């Protein structure tokens, strides 16, 4: 959107899938401990556009804050050992189930601008996915439906399912949520092009941890009136999640 | 539109 | 185990500038 500058270290979770060539942004992601990153599915394979990468095709930037710069001493690049589609990722209708996991080819040292995100549990999972609850989105995506020159970070509120569905022509299924405000509502953003696999996340008031409770997945344009944000529900995936790191690493 | 990462990576 | 706790922000009890709106929407 219609977002702002992030903070430095604001979202120290916040990943950028870099493509080696030619160097360009392919994706945001957030890192959720030393050595796994969490995207969308379609950042890494939507045949209907012949996308379809590979390991060797990509790269993992984190610590970032500026989109193109080298951010020399302060992010840090990795290389993929392993990618993790969904099984039942559903990308010939609906994207359903856009989720994919990476793991690094070597753990990545924390810093003041490298850090994980915590995962939700199903308690704090019912305790925040209320619609009209708030979230937060981050990425270095389309400003429009230019492109920026810091991380962009916008609040939004869940939207009630049944809005959600209104809203579109698409079947939307129990392993997504909408977000973003109504027309009468005034205030507007959203994520667009480019913010696709990054967080959407949560500040527990009753931890004071953040957890990402979402992944940026689609949108019928961005920021249009009576449309919204769909994002993967994290906690719904989470069973498959916890087998892909169990059993992986 | 990127500046140059290290020929490392 | 000290995921989704800040450097810059939670570890020092610093606030980032719209983290309140979260809340008051909670
Ligand atoms: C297979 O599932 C699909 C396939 C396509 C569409 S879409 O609605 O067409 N959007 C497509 C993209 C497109 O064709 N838009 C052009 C467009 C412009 C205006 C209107 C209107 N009104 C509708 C469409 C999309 O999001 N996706 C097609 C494949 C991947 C995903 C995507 O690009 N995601 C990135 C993204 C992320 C966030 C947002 C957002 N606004 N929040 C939008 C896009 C939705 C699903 Cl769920
Ligand atoms: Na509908
Ligand atoms: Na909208």
Known sequence: VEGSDAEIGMSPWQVMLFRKSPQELLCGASLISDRWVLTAAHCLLYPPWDKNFTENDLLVRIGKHSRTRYERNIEKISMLEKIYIHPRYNWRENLDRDIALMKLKKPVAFSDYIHPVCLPDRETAASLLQAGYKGRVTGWGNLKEGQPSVLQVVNLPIVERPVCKDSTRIRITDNMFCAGYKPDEGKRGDACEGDSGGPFVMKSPFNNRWYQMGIVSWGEGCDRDGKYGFYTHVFRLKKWIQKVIDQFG | DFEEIPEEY | ?26
């Open chain 3, 1 to 26: 185990a000290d995921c989704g706790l800040r450097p810059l922000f939670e570890k020092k009890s610093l606030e980032d500038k719209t983290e309140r709106e979260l809340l008051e929407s909670y």
